[PDB]
């Protein structure tokens, strides 16, 4: 580019653009303070300045002493608060250091500094991290952990509207910096929501998971009841007096003062799973995709049907097979199950 101002051209792309001509700077001219000081007082003030420049360059930071703020802001055409973000995330490189003259009473040096300024497109301040918990399902004898694959990683809420962000190609220069940020919709079974895939995985019984939250509640997911907490569905739990649940102590939290909230409120969602999800997850021995949020009854069924049909009766494990058929039939036809179970044990 021929001018810093040219960086704001609307029909440029996302890349690196270099200013064509070097910026030439004499320190004598930059440091006014020293000019009016005398003797060793002048010498010690310069020492402090040179030692600070060295400290910044080792950390790959920019010392903004040697560049006018008014000039840079005028050229970039940004607000006071944008400039603060721009100056915090910029990074430096020292590409040469050369001594140009060396007498016993006189010296001269040259330094080549190369700067890379990230120009922001959007800045996001009020942000939450997603934590997938899921749900337990007990199917034809097998316990199974079920999870939704959400198309976002961050929820943002600046004022009243909630926003779901998908990030790509991110690094950390104090703040998080990303090349790609796509805005998405939460999962659902409708034309105006995302059609997300659903994963299942077989787990060992008994299953217990208790996470202490920071505000003093507890997050519980468990295959069995204790302290009146229902099984299989997860929940946020709070108690008015210290007690032992799932073999550990749930304490009463310290009274808090109420402030203005920014907590997100996701939409609710019903989800229909295949009847034999437990047998499908068991014969894979890995975490496997079983449906989408917004799938039809017909497509969902024609998905493990051929696989499942070919688990046929064999000469070598008829009793072990007959016991599976019963566990599979129990909810459909309880009379038949009790019969099959009998012919199993015979």
């Amino acid at each position: 580019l021929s001018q810093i101002s040219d960086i704001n051209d609307e029909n440029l792309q996302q890349g690196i653009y270099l200013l064509r001509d070097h910026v030439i700077t004499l320190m004598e001219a930059t440091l006014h303070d020293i000019s009016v000081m005398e003797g060793m007082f002048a010498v010690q003030h310069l020492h402090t300045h040179l030692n600070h420049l060295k400290t910044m360059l080792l950390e790959r930071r920019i010392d903004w002493t040697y560049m006018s703020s008014t000039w840079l802001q005028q050229q970039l055409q940004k607000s006071d608060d944008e400039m603060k973000v721009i100056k915090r995330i910029a990074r430096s490189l020292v590409y040469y250091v050369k001594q140009t003259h060396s007498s016993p009473t006189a010296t001269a040096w040259e330094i080549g500094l190369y700067y890379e300024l990230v120009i922001p497109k959007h800045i996001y301040l009020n942000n939450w991290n997603v934590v997938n918990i899921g749900h337990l399902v007990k199917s034809a004898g097998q316990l199974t952990h079920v999870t939704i694959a959400h198309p976002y990683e961050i929820i943002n809420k600046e004022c009243v509207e909630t926003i779901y962000l998908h990030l790509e190609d991110c690094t950390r220069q104090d703040y998080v910096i990303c090349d790609v940020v796509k805005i998405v919709q939460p999962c659902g079974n409708s034309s105006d929501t995302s059609d997300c895939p659903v994963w299942a995985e077989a787990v060992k019984e008994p299953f217990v998971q208790v996470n202490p939250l920071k505000n003093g509640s507890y997050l519980v997911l468990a295959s069995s009841t204790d302290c009146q907490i229902p099984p299989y569905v997860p929940s946020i739990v709070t108690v008015n007096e210290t007690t032992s649940c799932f073999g550990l102590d749930f304490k009463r939290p310290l009274v808090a003062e109420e402030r203005l909230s920014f907590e997100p409120r996701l939409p609710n969602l019903q989800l229909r799973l295949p009847h034999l999800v437990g047998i499908i997850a068991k014969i894979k021995g890995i975490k496997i995709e079983v449906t989408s949020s917004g799938e039809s009854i017909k497509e969902q069924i024609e998905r493990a049907k051929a696989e499942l049909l070919r688990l046929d009766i064999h000469e070598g494990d008829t009793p072990a097979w007959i016991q599976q058929l019963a566990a599979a039939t129990k909810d459909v036809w309880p009379a038949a199950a009790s019969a099959l179970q009998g012919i199993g044990n015979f």
């Binding site: 903004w64 002493t65 703020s69 608060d81 400039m83 603060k84 973000v85 100056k87 915090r88 402030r259």
Partner: protein, 320 residues
């Protein structure tokens, strides 16, 4: 240094209460602004009576003294038909001239901001955090709900009931270091003269320097020129010049040698002063109207003249 830090840090909301509502924030802000700032009110307005000041205790130029700002120099070269009476009124050339700005007829109050009149309780040897507590207690002990000091606090010069609880007494050498202080606050003018003539002391009447007057009186004041009665003409003064000696009165005052010292009192102001504390008014008013207002209100009162008293040099910060 502060601006550089300001320029890379955005703001963040922190979920505690406003500092402006907390005592420790109100008490430490009023202190940092108005700790040593006071207001004095004369019984009625009365200014310093003369434009000339005889003060031989101060050593003349020949460390730097503050009173040298008011010192009339005796010059050898003058214009034709030049007389002191034309320029410096009734002042004695080689002494001190008090300007008309320090002698206003309508000035009713004196506002000052310095820690150089405190009695022996205050010591710079002690710690800042002690010297804070010490003052903060005394000001609480010497007040009762308003910002008016109790008469006990004042020196015996300013009140009949004064016992030097807060302020010390102004002495003879204070004029040299702190001129405006004395000229605006002293109740009476005391002289200190080694000039041949004062109190009818004649050269015969005395019953290296030894027994001798500093400046003896000559026949008269005159000039002479050589066909150039404009720019450069010789001047013959009405008294002697102290440039050679310049330590005479200062060394005399300390009593290294005996000499015929002359001292005369002249009453200016009645010993019934009244003294307010701007630190105690800041604490009290901020409980009613809130600190943001009171701070801005009292900061303007320090700039009543057009130059803010709190930014003046510590020894010279006295205004009528």
């Amino acid at each position: 240094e502060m601006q550089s830090l300001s320029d890379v840090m955005i703001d963040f909301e922190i979920p505690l209460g406003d500092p402006r509502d907390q005592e420790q924030y109100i008490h430490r802000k009023c202190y940092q602004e108005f700790a040593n700032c006071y207001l004095v009110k004369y019984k009625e307005p009365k200014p310093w009576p003369k434009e000339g000041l005889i003060a031989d205790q101060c050593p003349l130029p020949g460390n730097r003294q503050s009173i040298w700002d008011y010192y009339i120099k005796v010059e050898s070269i003058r214009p034709a038909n030049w007389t002191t009476k034309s320029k410096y009124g009734q002042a004695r050339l080689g002494s001190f001239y008090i300007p008309s700005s320090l002698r206003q007829i309508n000035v009713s109050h004196v506002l000052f901001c310095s820690d150089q009149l405190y009695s022996k309780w205050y010591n710079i040897e002690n710690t800042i955090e002690q010297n804070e507590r010490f003052l903060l207690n005394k000001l609480n002990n010497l007040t009762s709900g308003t910002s008016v000091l109790k008469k006990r606090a004042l020196p015996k010069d300013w009140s009949s009931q004064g016992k030097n609880a807060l302020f010390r007494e102004i002495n003879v050498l204070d004029i040299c270091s702190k001129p405006e202080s004395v000229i605006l606050l002293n109740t009476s003018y005391y002289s200190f003269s080694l000039w041949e003539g004062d109190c009818n002391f004649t050269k015969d009447m005395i019953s290296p320097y030894a027994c001798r007057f500093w400046r003896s009186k000559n026949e008269k004041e005159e000039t002479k020129c050589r066909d150039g009665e404009t720019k450069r003409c010789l001047y013959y003064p009405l008294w002697d010049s102290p440039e050679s000696t310049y330590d005479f009165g200062y060394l005399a005052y300390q009593k290294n040698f005996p000499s015929p010292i002359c001292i005369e009192q002249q009453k200016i102001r009645d010993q019934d002063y009244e003294v307010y504390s701007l630190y105690q008014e800041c604490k009290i008013a901020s409980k009613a109207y809130g600190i943001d207002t009171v701070l801005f209100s009292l900061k303007n009162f320090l700039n009543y003249t057009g130059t803010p008293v709190n930014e003046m040099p510590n020894a010279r910060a006295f205004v009528g």
